[model samples]
Target chain A: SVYDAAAQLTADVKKDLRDSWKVIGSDKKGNGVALMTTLFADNQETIGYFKRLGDVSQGMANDKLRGHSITLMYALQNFIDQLDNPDDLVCVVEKYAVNHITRKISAAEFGKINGPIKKVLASKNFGDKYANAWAKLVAVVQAAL
Target chain B: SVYDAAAQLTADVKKDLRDSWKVIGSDKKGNGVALMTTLFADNQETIGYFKRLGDVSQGMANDKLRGHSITLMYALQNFIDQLDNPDDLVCVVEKYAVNHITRKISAAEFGKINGPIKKVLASKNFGDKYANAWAKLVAVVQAAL
Candidate 1:
């Protein structure tokens, strides 16, 4: 029961996303970086975390944004794929989660990125199912932090 | 039933593998390249996969070999660490299996590398437990090839 809802959501989210990993990862083509860009754009306050960020495309162009977003995307995909055992997944992630605190990531700044990704997935038709899934995932990472 | 023995072998090998992952991956010494270089040194025929092979430590100094050895060192550690679900591990490696074939790796060459790593484990005191385990693993990879 610990992961029942998350378990269900993982399957649905994976079906929607894994099938189109490249499409979602596309910079010039797909909406992979597009959603991440929008996250920073909407949260101009958090944009200052970086030395700079201009457009959704602008984030893609910069090495900093590009690498960080790609890292998040892959980590997210790994998380979604590992949801078959949510508690076990939590154990695997717990150490890495603690390391984030050392990097000075505030909870609120994380939420900005989280909100945009949730919205983007929902807009792509994952709807409330994956919306809930993404929330659960963020909560787990937050709890670890 | 086919994987029954393979399943049996995983736990002990993993305990030994993860326990000494650092030793086996020691870039400070030659062990990082130790096992990989051992793969080529004893099996000079397989040495052609690269231009050639000289000192076992020589391969470790090569930039490309350093990362590749370290990568396999990490992957093997993770594989051993995750042996709780043998099939999950298999499923994860199944794709990478096919790619090695695409690269035109023959069975003989694969076996060449496999033998030395197995030997290295046994020589390092994992003894029969991991010796047999690596053999079973190589068998599976051989079957896939």
Candidate 2:
């Protein structure tokens, strides 16, 4: 069934990302920040391992925490850009999956992202169609890993 | 002597570009447009090759021109982040230099960036220190080309 879900992610999903993230670029407080809140807070070890956030304690909510999201935000946008070539996309996602292994990110951690991704789309009022689109995209990314 | 000048670009040159670009985002007549003017307008044959700008006649500018400048601005910010690591930065700069050959961009056009860089700083009063740092950074990026 995951394969069926992954197969549903269409090229149409690309426009939703452009409208949401590119248009929203911090215009509303915590629009994008909420995603980071889930990302770092849910993964203390990951945050603690990052050198730039060294001074901040784990489970901390801070600006550098916000900045870390920017780096990941840039990375996600890069990934979305390369999504058309599925093998290219698969290779890229698998590389991050492998790198996260070195950082002690467990297989369970892979699914941790979907909640935040859904929250971001909901806040944007991007609607269910785009939500399914995003879900499918992540499912495909997860399958590749 | 070239490497001597290249070494002058250091971590201290790091300056936030957001304040300047956001200020000039849509303020003046030619603010953001000028970079596109530098990148696309000043040269026709190379510009003509960019099929995306087909909507705008070669040498004629429009919204896509502003969009083109946004691409370069992202690149500038990317390069700035790596400034703290000069060897890493130089490697990135030279990689772009090598790639530009395929784009019909020359070392001559690299020097062309100075005009728009100064203009943005001048509009923002980004101060002499930051301005000089940028000029030197461009010079080194050019030298690597």
Candidate 3:
């Protein structure tokens, strides 16, 4: 059974998560590009899977990177939108688990984005409490993987 | 005064160069991406100038690389389109010379793409004759720098 990380999200945290994302998510590719660029900077292994983009320097300016970034945030938004329904969130996580499997990406590798995620959130002036909430939510998603 | 390399390009040579590019240039990003990727593979220094992309392993999927590739092919098209007009071509070369200057790129670096350009043209089944014509045009552009 996929974990319902949303269940663990406190009411305030959920609000913070969604509300903050509402504004930030509006610029999906921009914010996602920032996050991915930061991730590639901090995590070298992350770029290894993008075969089309290959192993070279990663940059937000690459269309392939931009495409991946947009896909990432869009997926996040889809999962976040389903916070009210644990079953739906689980479904989403399960789908991504399979998606990652085909890509040869393990849950461990998936978790690597955590630091970049928090960093992006912090950069946006998200407080520790907010970051923690996002972390917990991410943990639940990771659990499903 | 920019040298008219076009003047040196014979009618048959020019036809081969321009016609070959017509098919290839239509897929601007694709061909340019292929060329750049090949260039980066062959020449390690070409990727160094893109400040926004920084240095890393390059891939076609990267938005930055894609953007640059499009810009590259588009610029090539612009110059190719003006092949009939030596003065206009000279103006184009002069503009790019200045563009490269601010980016700290040298004529030496500009000329480095020659091999990859030839490789890509060859991949499209362009014969030695076609490649030579391109080399001539590229030489003119290089002269202005």
Candidate 4:
């Protein structure tokens, strides 16, 4: 349930960005500036809530941001693409869902699902920003689960 | 001239051993034991001589033995057999002699000589005793040469 919620949130972010047709860049004026700010702000707020619950620390929140930026971006992109092409999204979402389910079941199952994802994420050609974002999203989901 | 002398010596050894037959393993018995002893003894002696000539040590002599034994035994057996049969012993003797001379003239030359010899030695399944004797004999000659 938590994983689905995370996936839905990722999908929503992707849709919002795609609908706005805004370009995301590191520079302040390069578009998606407001959206990036809002996304990060929301992350900080959620991190604060978790820390208040004694589930994590402010340091963990900061460290996690360092790691999650890439994965979140990629997941956002994939979700946007799926919105644009619903039919093609089935396989991609199915893959994530399977991994999510399996990882929930056992460490061995998680390994089976995660190993290949790690390999793809590690590929030289893969976009680092997207990978980092997706990684952060996964961490959040993993902790919440 | 040294090549020629070496060729002649090789021929004589082959001929003497082939014709006499008693010289084949002459050191297999008694006073003749000294002959085998001398053959082995001379082998060791020559190894030392070769080492000095090449400005190498007894260690290099030992290192070269694994290869030399294979070459010498092959040359002695096949070369002698060829000599006794209709094939050309002089040619074989000359070829073998030239190789030795080349090795003597240059350490690089010896590497070339040893390459094929080492390959053949490594490939062949010679008996442990024979291999040991061959290894020892090679060390002896290497030291002498």
Candidate 5:
């Protein structure tokens, strides 16, 4: 049931997002990248911050990387807290992690974010072993990212 | 559009509930009665507490009565907030309010919950006139209920 709902919602949201993107001319690779960057900055600020910091905040003189790991942990925790259903959480993580892996994230950054991510996956009562498997999958992807 | 997102989610969740009810063999009159009872409790709580004490807790209870409402609202808000676009609120409020009116939630109940609902709607610059019309419609439905 959880899988059904997750699959259905994911497909529906993706379709909706695609349609919206098309209408806004964001389907193009360049525009899609810009739009996603802007959206991620506004809504996924912590993730965006980490990305920027990881790259020296695009050569900013005062860019600080000292707190990036902690920020990443906090962001992962925040994501866990926002999930209303365990299955939904798993689905999202699986989807995003796979996407990141395919798109190229990097193993080191994946390692950096892995602990909190695994903690989130293991927080529920479903099946820690299964969750760990997913975590491993995500970790592999993160490495690719 | 927030309205589109909210409406789509509402329809989808309603379908989910309906499908779940079928699995339990309670999809027809039996569960309909139960749902109506729950909705009436929410309606009464919303109107009673708001009228007598102006307590916001009544709104919370109302939302709990139909747990899907909160989820749908959050989903819509998440999608719409990302776009920084503000136009679909009217569509969402009108569509959602029409469903509420058809289900017999009162104008008083609407007014009680209106602030938060309107705030969400206004965030997308949804028109106020439709909400006002919805309030009037709710009043009419209340008399019927």
Candidate 6:
């Protein structure tokens, strides 16, 4: 529902998004580590922003960062799961955006995760349509951020 | 739906459960810490079982335990959120049960959390029907475990 304007988000697109996500989200911990690694590598400047996660140099090796990655993966899974109810999905996204605001994490900084997410989907061979579906989803999230 | 036999789960019941959970689950971090504290206090023997949490004696102060409490709350939130899709809910429950099996955690031991859950619900003043709904949900989970 939130993606109606941003990304037509037809029923077929939603199905593709959920189906592809089920596979990628299944290994939450491992994939979470992969995502964080790719995100930091793709945008090195973003690394310094996560001081709360302890030394960024330790990367995912830091227990707090590793745990946060797992949490992040779970949060993404939750967002995908709530797509059927746009109100609920938006509620979560808005809350996260507000948290970022409090932490002084800029919207542009928050948007940096998109590249790594696409990389993961591409690596999975989820197909062009699946990536298209995710792009729509990401657009909605970026708007919120 | 795994809950068909376990819970009448009429649309009304589901709505009530979800509504009540929204309030409870909103404060995930606080309520998670609260639930674990109550659980450990209510069932002292359960305390020794969480060795993986590294010296359960540290109680909620242990970062691992605290982190885990939050994860448990998120998992519970996920469960409630997926109540509309029994197949998805069962998939999660079965996976959790299997994980517990590997950890040698018995179904009875797992079920012990029920009391604290109820205690929290009661403290929150959620009506009797609300707890009744949870009881049905718990039965399905206990059976799966």
Show model 2 residue runs off by greater than 4 Å. A1-145, B1-5, B15-32, B38-52, B55-66, B127-129
Ranking by TM-score: 6, 3, 1, 2, 5, 4
| Chain B TM, per prediction | 0.72, 0.65, 0.88, 0.35, 0.29, 0.85
Clash totals in order: 1, 0, 15, 32, 8, 0
Interface RMSD of 1: 12.5
Best by the TM-score measure: 6
Full candidate order by lDDT, most accurate first: 6, 3, 2, 1, 5, 4
At residue A144, what lDDT does model 1 achieve?
Answer: 53
For model 4, residues A1-145, the per-residue Cα lDDT tens digits are: 4334344445544543443323342211212223233433444533342231232332223323322332333333444444434332432344344435643543233223233333343443435544444453344334333
Model 3 CAPRI quality: incorrect
Candidate 4 off by > 4 Å: A1-145, B1-16, B19-49, B52-63, B85-87, B104-145
TM-scores of the candidates, chain A only: 0.67, 0.66, 0.88, 0.34, 0.28, 0.86
Poorly placed runs, candidate 3 (over 4 Å): A1-145, B55-58
Q: Model 1, which residues run further than 4 Å from truth?
A: A1-145, B1-29, B51-57
TM-score of 2: 0.44
Superposed Cα deviation of residue B81, candidate 6 (Å): 1.8
Which CAPRI level is candidate 5?
A: incorrect
List the global CA lDDT of all models.
Answer: 0.55, 0.55, 0.69, 0.35, 0.36, 0.70
Whole-structure CA lDDT of model 6 = 0.70
Indicate the docking level reached by candidate 6: incorrect
Q: Of the candidates numbered 1 and 3, which has the greater lDDT value?
A: 3
- In order of appearance, the predictions have TM-scores of 0.45, 0.44, 0.48, 0.22, 0.24, 0.53
